[PDB]
């Protein structure tokens, strides 16, 4: 599980 915090980023992974 990977959370992505930036513009244009798929929150989930």
């Amino acid at each position, epitope marked *: *599980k*990977s*959370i*992505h*915090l*930036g*513009p*244009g*980023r798929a929150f989930y992974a």
Partner: antibody
Framework: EVQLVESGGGLVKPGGSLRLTCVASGFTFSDVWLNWVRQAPGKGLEWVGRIKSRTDGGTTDYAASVKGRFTISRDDSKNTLYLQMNSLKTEDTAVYSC??????????????????????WGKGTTVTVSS | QSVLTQPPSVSAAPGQKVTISCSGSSSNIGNNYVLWYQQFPGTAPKLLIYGNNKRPSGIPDRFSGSKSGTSATLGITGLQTGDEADYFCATWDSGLSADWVFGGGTKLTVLS
């Protein structure tokens, strides 16, 4: 020696075109998303656009102030990022810099968090749109 | 004419503390996570704060960040002359192009 070096800036007539290039070194360039940003004298920094990494689809996003006029492309094999600026306006005058999106990852008790930020910044190249 | 609003200038003597405010909307600071950078003349901006209040390794606890509503604040305590620099906030936009967006910058003077 991680670095980004921009070139191509100069004096251009309004209505003109100009191509900037940014050369990356010291890091796996193909792995990262890249931004163009710009700063007018006495003004704040302004984001121009990004291009994502090939694995993330390679697509581009643009600021509303440049969309339709500016085009961003990368050449992974030459560690090179480009910005093709057409129909330049006096108000596009600025120091234009290239940046990477970096991250700090926090390993959570279950799951990893990725905090992104403009990480590596080039020193910039001056574009003057003036008659 | 800067997406996020900061004061142009702030100052105090060594030993003192200071805060620098950054004002935005629901669409940047409200929805997203704020970053702070320190820049010296001629030099690349250095990440000071991410995720509203997290410090990278090497950044001492003298620097602290907070966010509430649509504003964010950076605090610096035990001011050193080495802190004299420009500070700017950054976050991103919730719109269709998800622009990164920046404060205009605050020049901190450490009074000498």
């Amino acid at each position: 020696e991680v670095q980004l070096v921009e070139s191509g800036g100069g004096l251009v007539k309004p209505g003109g075109s100009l191509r900037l290039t940014c050369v990356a070194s010291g890091f796996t360039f193909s792995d990262v998303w890249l931004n163009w940003v710009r700063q007018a004298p006495g003004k704040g920094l302004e984001w121009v656009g990004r291009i994502k990494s090939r694995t993330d689809g390679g697509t581009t996003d643009y600021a509303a102030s440049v969309k339709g006029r500016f085009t961003i492309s990368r050449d992974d094999s030459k560690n090179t990022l480009y910005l093709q600026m057409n129909s330049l306006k006096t108000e596009d005058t600025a120091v234009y810099s290239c940046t990477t999106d970096g991250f700090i990852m926090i390993r959570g008790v279950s799951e990893d968090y990725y905090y992104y930020y403009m990480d590596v910044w080039g020193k910039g190249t001056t574009v003057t749109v003036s008659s | 004419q800067s997406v996020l609003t900061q004061p142009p200038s702030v100052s105090a003597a060594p030993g003192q503390k200071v805060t620098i405010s950054c004002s935005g909307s629901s669409s940047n600071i409200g929805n997203n996570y704020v970053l702070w950078y320190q820049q010296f003349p001629g030099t690349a901006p250095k990440l000071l704060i991410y995720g509203n209040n997290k410090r990278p390794s090497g950044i001492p606890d003298r620097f602290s960040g907070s966010k509430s509503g649509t504003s964010a604040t950076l605090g610096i305590t035990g001011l050193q002359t080495g802190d004299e620099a420009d500070y700017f906030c950054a976050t991103w936009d919730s719109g269709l192009s998800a622009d990164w967006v920046f404060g205009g910058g605050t020049k901190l003077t450490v009074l000498s």
